[PDB]
Design a protein around this nucleic acid. Structure first.
Ligand SMILES: [Zn+2]
Lengths: 129, 140, 81, 44, 150
RNA sequence: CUCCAAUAGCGUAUAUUAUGUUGCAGUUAAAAAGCUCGUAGUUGAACUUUGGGCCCGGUUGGCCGGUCGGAUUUCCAACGGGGCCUUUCCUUCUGGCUAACCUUGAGUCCUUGUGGCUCUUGGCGAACCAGGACUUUUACUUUGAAAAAAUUAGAGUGUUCAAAGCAGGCGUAUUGCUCGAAUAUAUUAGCAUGGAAUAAUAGAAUAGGACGUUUGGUUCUAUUUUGUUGGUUUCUAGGACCAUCGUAAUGAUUAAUAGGGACGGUCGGGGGCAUCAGUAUUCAAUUGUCAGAGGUGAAAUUCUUGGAUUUAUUGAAGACUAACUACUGCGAAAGCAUUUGCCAAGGACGUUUUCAUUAAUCAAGAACGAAAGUUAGGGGAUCGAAGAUGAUCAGAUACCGUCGUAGUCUUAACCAUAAACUAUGCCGACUAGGGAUCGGGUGGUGUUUUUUUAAUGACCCACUCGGCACCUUACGAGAAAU
């Protein structure tokens, strides 16, 4: 039984890249997948993507460029206490100057840098670099 | 995820599981079982000079020559101990209440005897290195 | 392969695929209007009937059930819609 | 560690010390004080 | 996939995208609701009715030409059974399996099979019971099942 | 006797410091319960205000600086907060309040004027007072108070330095002047505020649903005023309920390449009970001939007027299912192979059927489980643990042969574990090529069967689900076989 619909969307994207592909079908999409897809895109880590409407849960086609090393999900959505954000980025980003911890907060799904700027925190979704 | 829970509410399972597995720690388990050093508890041990080994050695200041055979007082176990710098052997006679320590050399010499675990520090309450330097005198 | 249009698959290679593995899914069974000139009206049969569909008035038959597509009764005719 | 402890009749795990540190540190100091008390046996 | 055996059979109706129409379909909600009723009046399960409506008539999905599901139509017209159809056909089957195990106390396969059918029954009762369509502490007993179904 | 290390401090002894939430491992040399069901527990598909328009005021930063290091307007981007209008309860009435403009009443300091604020007489709510009347329930996060001091981090200060201490620093050092004694940290829970993503909870389907401008009938509550205090009942005000007419888009989300169920035609050595066959093995009776027959590396124990072994016709008993046979095909696994009848079961497939989250995995608990073995009956052909025997020659390259108890089969009950093995948890999802094959289904002016063409059937081609497998490889993995 599909536990995380996000998890299947990231690992799909990840396996595409690793195999040199330029697109992936993903299934079944969600509000959360879209927003996560949206953040990566805003930052160049993927191209455009299309939501196809099966009369169901959705499918998505992502077009990816090849700037992407890894997009991972964080399996329990642990609470982060805004000061703990440093400890996450460090644990799991390649350097202090690029890459993002993306996470869910009362003020929207946003990467940690926007989170820092907006001075909000919340729970941790996953990451890109 | 292989094998641990990851859930946001799996904190208890995660603590218990740790507790359970700490018992594989040799140090931890001794700490909690209250198991509680070479011969006893202490750093040193007092002992009685039974006899002086290696008096008949020809070659002076050897390793066979320095050995005295001391029995520990708290157990009756008898054991051999170096007495450092052979001229020291003049100070120990027999039945002379010696403190044993750990010998604990770092790297082996040419003629050393492995299994000489101990060294003699004080005898009748005064230090051998205080005796060898002619600071104190042996009380009787 | 390596780069292709998942969004605009060719109708042929879409046609050969399984009904749940097309781009968006739909059935591949049809309905039909069916008549035997003894009567003057037209009953509507499903291409995979299961029930041995009896005509409007005359207990005649029309199609027996099968593994899939119903076999229509020998001396008849039909159109799809 | 699971069956070694159960070999003895009493549960081995059940008997333990609340503090490893205090038990261990006090045990060495008490032993040194004793060894000190011991002296070779004599006649009056 | 498949709760009481190793089977991996993907296999179902691929329902159409078109939630209304069929445009070649005339008739009326009026008509087929009447149709739904008199059928269920003969003692037909909603499933049977859906099938019966699918072949002889044009009724692509009852819920499309009528606003409602077939069981809900039944319930409205006061035609709903004492227990849901699927629970019924489980119980009815367990009865027939047990009646056979009584006649054949040497058929271990049947014993095993009975267990599965009842384990599915009890789990389904538990569901219906959770959602109030069965009274709290409604329960399948084998001693009383034969009554329940026939 | 000669150097080296640390130097008022240096040596020696002892124990100890330098399990995986983050983040371990469980094919082959650590470790997946034999198998399935299953409660607790953990977990659990997608969908319900999004988009667009307008205003307001903040804090960094640029380029100017006006100005005697920092200053503010306008030009500018950028990042954030608030409030509006978009079909949009903000708990709600009943006033108290108004700060804000749709206002404007005059005009205007002044850059040709919407640049600008004082300024009261028609026209903003919510900003919050306080009285009534009522409110689905949580998690998370924010900010704010909290948290004793000591220690810790850390500012200031020439304890002569320093560890410290919280002192001290300036003069008219003859009648006094003065800076201090900060700040940070401190989480679970409770309190208070802001957010409304993510995740739960509750809602209207036998309508006992929602609002009301309506009204009947029913019932509770009791403050004002009748001079006062008590009694009783009128009036009046506010609930609650049963009806009836009114208002209304009246009220049920997809239909998961989730899951259950119905249905159609199939497939299988899946199971149970009964049943029918086959040759063989042993034995019996009848028979035919003659001296050996048996067994082994070689022998012997053994059987032979009792015609052995061999032959013939015929009969009984119990077990088994050869060849076909294919590790295919089926089953949860143990396991399942003559045939037919009955009994219930199952997967896959087909499916514009049905239900609609019912599910995944699972401590406890439970169903089944090869051979041997155990209890009580039956059976007891065969093979045959035990036992008893044969000869033991040069060797053992060719360590067995004979008798044979239990047992082997079956019923009723036990035991309850196997290298119960792919020596590899379960559910799902993604990633790459090829030809065979099993089942199911779809498509064909394919082949073959003849009859008069068909219908059937078997076969051929293409496709598609779901199987048991093999081949080749990688844009993958491994210590390497793979
Ligand atoms: Zn007809």
């Amino acid at each position: 039984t599909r536990s995380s619909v996000l998890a299947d969307a990231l690992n799909a994207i990840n396996n595409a890249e690793k195999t040199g592909k330029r697109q992936v079908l993903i299934r079944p999409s969600s509000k959360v997948i879209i927003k996560f897809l949206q953040v990566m895109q805003k930052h160049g880590y993927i191209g455009e993507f299309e939501y196809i409407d099966d009369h169901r849960s959705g499918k998505i086609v992502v077009q990816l460029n090849g700037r992407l090393n890894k997009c991972g999900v964080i399996s329990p959505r642990f609470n982060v206490k805004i000061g703990d954000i440093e400890k996450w980025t460090a644990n799991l980003l390649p350097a202090r100057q690029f890459g993002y911890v993306i996470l869910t907060t009362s003020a929207g799904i946003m990467d940690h840098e926007e989170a820092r700027r907006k001075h909000v925190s919340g729970k941790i979704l996953g990451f890109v670099y | 995820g292989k094998g641990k829970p990851r859930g946001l509410n799996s904190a208890r399972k995660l603590r218990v599981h740790r507790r359970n597995n700490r018992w594989a720690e040799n140090n931890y388990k001794k700490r909690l079982l209250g198991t509680a050093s070479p011969f006893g508890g202490s750093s040193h041990a007092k002992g009685i000079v039974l006899e002086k080994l290696g008096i008949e050695s020809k070659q002076p200041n050897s390793a066979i020559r320095k050995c005295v055979r001391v029995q520990l007082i708290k157990n009756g176990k008898k054991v051999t101990a170096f007495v450092p710098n052979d001229g020291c052997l003049n100070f120990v006679d027999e039945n002379d209440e010696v403190l044993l320590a750990g010998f604990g050399r770092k790297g082996k010499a040419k003629g050393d005897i492995p299994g000489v675990r101990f060294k003699v520090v004080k005898v009748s309450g005064v230090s051998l290195l205080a005796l060898w330097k002619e600071k104190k005198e042996k009380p009787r | 392969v390596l780069v292709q249009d998942l969004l605009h698959p060719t109708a042929a290679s879409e046609a050969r695929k399984h009904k749940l593995k097309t781009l968006v899914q739909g059935p591949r069974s049809y309905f039909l209007d069916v008549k035997c000139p003894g009567c003057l009206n037209i009953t509507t049969v499903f291409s995979h009937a299961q029930t041995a569909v009896t005509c409007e008035s005359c207990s005649t038959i029309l199609c027996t059930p099968t593994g899939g597509k119903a076999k229509l009764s020998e001396g008849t005719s039909f159109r799809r819609k | 560690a699971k069956k070694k402890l159960h070999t003895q009749g009493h549960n081995a795990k059940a008997f333990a010390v609340a503090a490893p540190g205090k038990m261990a540190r006090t045990m060495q100091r008490s032993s040194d004080v004793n060894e000190r008390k011991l002296h070779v046996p004599m006649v009056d | 996939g498949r709760m009481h055996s190793a089977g991996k059979g993907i296999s179902s109706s691929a329902i159409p995208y078109s939630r209304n129409a069929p445009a070649w379909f005339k008739l009326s909600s009026e008509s087929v609701i009447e149709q739904i009723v008199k059928y269920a009046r003969k003692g037909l399960t909603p499933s049977q009715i859906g099938v019966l409506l699918r072949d002889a008539h044009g009724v692509t999905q009852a819920r499309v030409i009528t606003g409602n599901k077939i069981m809900r139509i039944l319930k409205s017209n006061g035609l709903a059974p004492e227990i849901p159809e699927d629970l019924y056909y489980l119980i009815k089957k367990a009865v027939s399996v047990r009646k056979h195990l009584e006649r054949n106390r040497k058929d271990k396969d049947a014993k095993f099979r009975l267990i599965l059918i009842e384990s599915r029954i009890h789990r389904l009762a538990r569901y219906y019971r959770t959602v109030a369509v069965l009274p709290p502490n409604w329960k399948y007993e084998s001693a009383t099942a034969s009554a329940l179904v026939n």
